[PDB]
């Protein structure tokens, strides 16, 4: 037959995350890979392959 769903496990709420994963450095500082792409464009403009 059919019957409504039991929510035994949802009703207890986790006050904490699952994983104790340490926070990375790059989440706090300006993005590095952005800056590498910036310096790529800088090298292309120094070679004049990209016009300002």
């Amino acid at each position: 037959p059919y019957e409504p769903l039991i929510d035994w496990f949802t009703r207890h709420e986790e006050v904490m995350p699952l994983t104790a994963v340490p926070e990375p450095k790059r989440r706090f500082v300006p993005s590095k890979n952005e800056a590498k792409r910036v310096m790529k464009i800088v090298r292309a403009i120094r070679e004049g392959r990209i016009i300002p």
């Binding site: 006050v15 904490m16 995350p17 699952l18 104790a20 340490p22 926070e23 450095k25 989440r27 706090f28």
Partner: protein, 437 residues
């Protein structure tokens, strides 16, 4: 006599020079020639006499005289009740072993088990550990080089027995070898069940040397650090020492309050002991200063007559706190006003204060006078990675300090709102710490 007079290896000499030690305390000056002689010992000494270093020197002498590989053995084994005392003994022992060649480690219930497991798989030539986690590591970790046991020490068997780890200790000693093992143990007082473990441990016949209102402030767990900050600003230009539990929270609160630019001295086991001595000297001579310290680093040294004793964290030994405030009052003719922070789960401690029969004064809190820096705290933690990690470390070591606490009737982790604790540390979401709850 002196430490530098006695026969020692030169890196141990460099170590003792850099720890600032020249002279000997008298009971340790007594026990050191039997410590070199190779006899078992028990000993009555005050907590913090330097009695860690007392065994640390001939243990490293034994490891120097044997010169065995890290794969070869473990040898020196240290049993100590408190996670905080374990970290203090470890932090003293680090530079000592660092000038030496051998290996040093930690086994603590509440640490990451795969970490301690991999360190045991590598092998550790000097183990410092809590009694409860040792049964897990001896029964469960495979391939761990156990058969050597060059020596073994117990510290404060009163505190093991008062926690109640003595049956675990009996199972440990029944796992432990005896013939290669020598046993040395320090305990300020003694009981019969202490002496029963002593009769099992001490392999030769040993020679042994034997030598008021409180403030209480009930606060919610979120606003208590803020209220500490507010009360510390209001009582600026008054020297005050704050008692903590975990050295990480000591270092983090010190770095935080120095980032809020009010002058704060730190005092903890991770602090280098010459720097520790410098900080204590500067606090004692400066006479208007903020001192952040743990419980037992404060226990390890005498205290100047202070404007305030503030105890933020839960105590290591509440009985020693009751004796400590009494000896603080009777020693200091200048009035030292003692307070402890409380959480509304902790009021049973109060009736144990009513078991202590000393008077008690409730110190009230105005909700209007709140420093309101918590948004700046959260913006700071979202900004600074370094402060973010130190905040997480103070939080982690704080919760593991609750885990390592004896009086469950006074402190249950199930009672505590970790959301408010994180907001006190300044996290809007509590970070995950791998803690049995």
């Amino acid at each position: 006599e002196k430490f530098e007079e006695l026969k020692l290896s030169q890196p141990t000499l460099k170590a003792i020079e850099k720890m600032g030690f020249t002279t000997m305390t008298s009971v340790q000056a007594r026990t050191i020639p039997p410590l070199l002689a190779g006899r078992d010992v028990l000993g009555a000494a005050k907590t913090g006499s330097g009695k860690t270093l007392a065994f640390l020197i001939p243990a490293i002498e034994l490891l120097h005289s044997l010169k065995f590989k890290p794969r070869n053995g473990t040898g020196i084994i240290v049993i100590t009740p408190t996670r905080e005392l374990a970290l203090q003994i470890f932090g003293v022992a680090r530079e000592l072993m660092e000038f030496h060649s051998q290996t040093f480690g930690i086994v603590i219930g509440g640490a990451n088990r795969r970490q301690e497991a991999e360190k045991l798989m590598k092998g550790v030539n000097m183990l410092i550990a809590t009694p409860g986690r040792l049964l897990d590591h001896l029964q469960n970790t495979k391939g761990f080089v156990f058969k050597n046991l060059k020596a073994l020490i117990i510290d404060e068997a009163d505190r093991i027995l008062e926690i109640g780890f003595e049956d675990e200790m009996r199972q440990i000693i029944k796992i432990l070898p005896n013939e290669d093992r020598q046993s040395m143990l320090f305990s300020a007082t003694q009981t019969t069940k202490v002496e029963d473990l002593a009769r099992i441990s001490l392999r030769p016949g040993p020679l042994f040397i034997n030598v008021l209102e409180q403030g209480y402030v009930v606060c919610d767990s979120d606003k208590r650090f803020l209220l500490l900050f507010s009360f510390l600003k209001r009582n600026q230009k008054k020297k005050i020492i704050v008692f903590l539990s975990s050295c990480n929270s000591v270092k983090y609160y010190a770095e935080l309050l120095n980032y809020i630019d009010l002058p704060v001295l730190e005092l903890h086991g991770k602090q280098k002991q010459q720097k520790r001595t410098n900080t204590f000297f500067e606090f004692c001579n400066a006479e208007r200063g903020i001192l952040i310290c743990t419980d037992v680093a404060a226990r390890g040294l005498d205290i100047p007559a202070v404007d305030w004793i503030i105890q933020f964290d839960p105590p290591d030994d509440p009985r020693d706190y009751i004796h400590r405030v009494g000896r603080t009052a009777r020693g200091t003719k200048g009035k030292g006003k003692s307070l402890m922070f409380l959480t509304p789960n902790e009021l049973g401690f109060l009736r144990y204060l009513k078991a202590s029969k000393v008077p008690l004064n409730e110190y009230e809190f105005p909700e209007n006078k709140i420093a309101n820096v918590q948004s700046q705290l959260e913006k700071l933690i979202k900004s600074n990675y370094y402060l973010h990690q130190t905040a997480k470390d103070g939080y982690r070591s704080y919760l593991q300090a609750y885990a390592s606490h004896s009086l469950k009737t006074v402190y249950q982790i199930d009672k505590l709102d970790l959301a408010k604790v994180a907001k006190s540390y300044g996290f809007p979401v509590p970070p995950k710490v791998n803690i049995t709850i």
